[PDB]
Amino acid sequence: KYRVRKNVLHLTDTEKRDFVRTVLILKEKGIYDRYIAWHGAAGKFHTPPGSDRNAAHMSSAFLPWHREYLLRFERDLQSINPEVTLPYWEWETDAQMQDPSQSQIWSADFMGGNGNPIKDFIVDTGPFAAGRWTTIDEQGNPSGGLKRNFGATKEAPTLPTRDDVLNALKITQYDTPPWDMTSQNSFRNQLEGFINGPQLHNRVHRWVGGQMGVFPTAPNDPVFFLHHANVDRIWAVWQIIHRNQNYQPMKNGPFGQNFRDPMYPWNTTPEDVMNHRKLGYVYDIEL
Ligand SMILES: [Cu+2]
Known part of the structure; x- marks a missing residue:
């Protein structure tokens, strides 16, 4: 309840500077690469083998897996700078602009x-421009x-x-x-965005294009984390609204998808991350 994750558009100039600075340190130390790799590894871990479901997406664990992923990321940010929390990109409000590509998130001092x-x-342009930030395949x-090509696709010309x-x-x-x-x-x-897709989460990836347009390379773009913080916030809100609902499946789903199954590549289970407040953070809008 102490770490507050803020809307990107609410961040002060120094908060934005400090976040960028901190990510660049994580990158320099070799730590950021672990996050790119874990996400790629999970995506290739099929539940069960032969299915398109995997540990990180296209099934029930999509939400808790990314919640855990972001938690670890934020904890690494905090180790460098205890004042830095993971902000969220509220893409649904950017979608209201005449040109969402004129959103402040894409300014040279931020993304x-x-x-x-x-x-x-x-x-x-910006802190993650080629020559300032290296990427892997x-x-x-x-x-x-890093590459980006906003709204260039026939299937996702707009943000959700x-x-x-x-x-x-x-x-x-x-x-x-x-x-x-x-x-x-x-x-x-x-929320993942498959029915009559791409919608919501899938649509944001396709709209950004570049490394974000394909799962395994997506975390090469720091905006990946800002996007998923928004997804995590939406889930958090769903949880508050539908308080008597719980995670499914509770059992009998594929191994890796059930409530008490470990989420590859970690030992963390969906149950472990069901209450975000218990993990030590909250979204500004709750306050
Ligand atoms: Cu993902």
Whole structure:
């Protein structure tokens, strides 16, 4: 309840400077790379083998897995600078702008901006521009720079809307069998964005493009963490609203997806992270 995660648009100039500074230290120390790797590893861990479900997405663990991922990340930020917490990118409000690409999140003192089409969409502004920030491919090898290409896709020309968010929050069940990308009347599947997709979470990745447009390379872009903090906030809000609902499946789901199953690559279970307040943080909007 002490660590407050703030909306990016509410951050002071120094808060933004301190966050960026801290991420760059995590990168320099070699720590940031662990987060890129863990996310890639989980995505290749299929539950069960042969299924498209994996430890980190396309099934019920999507939400708790990322909650745990962000918790560890924030804890690493805190070790460097105890005043730094993980902010969230409220993309549904950016979606209301005439041009969401004019959002302050993409300023040169924060995330930096869109890709340069002359340079094949390499990002050349901000703290994470090519030449200031190195990237790796799916195999762990150097890839030579962060890329972004906002709204360039036929399937995701726009960010998800406030209405889209409110509509997901109306869903009563956390998830439903068969606990996959086809789950109907499922908050998890709705928020993940598969039904008539891409929507919500899947749509944001596709809208940003570049490394964010493909799962395994997505964390090369620091905005990955800001996006997932927003996803985590939306889940937190669903949890408050639907207080008598709990995680599903409680049992008999594939191993790695049940309430008390360890979430690869860690030993942490969904049960361990069900109460975000117990983990030591809250979102500003709760206060
Ligand atoms: Cu992910």
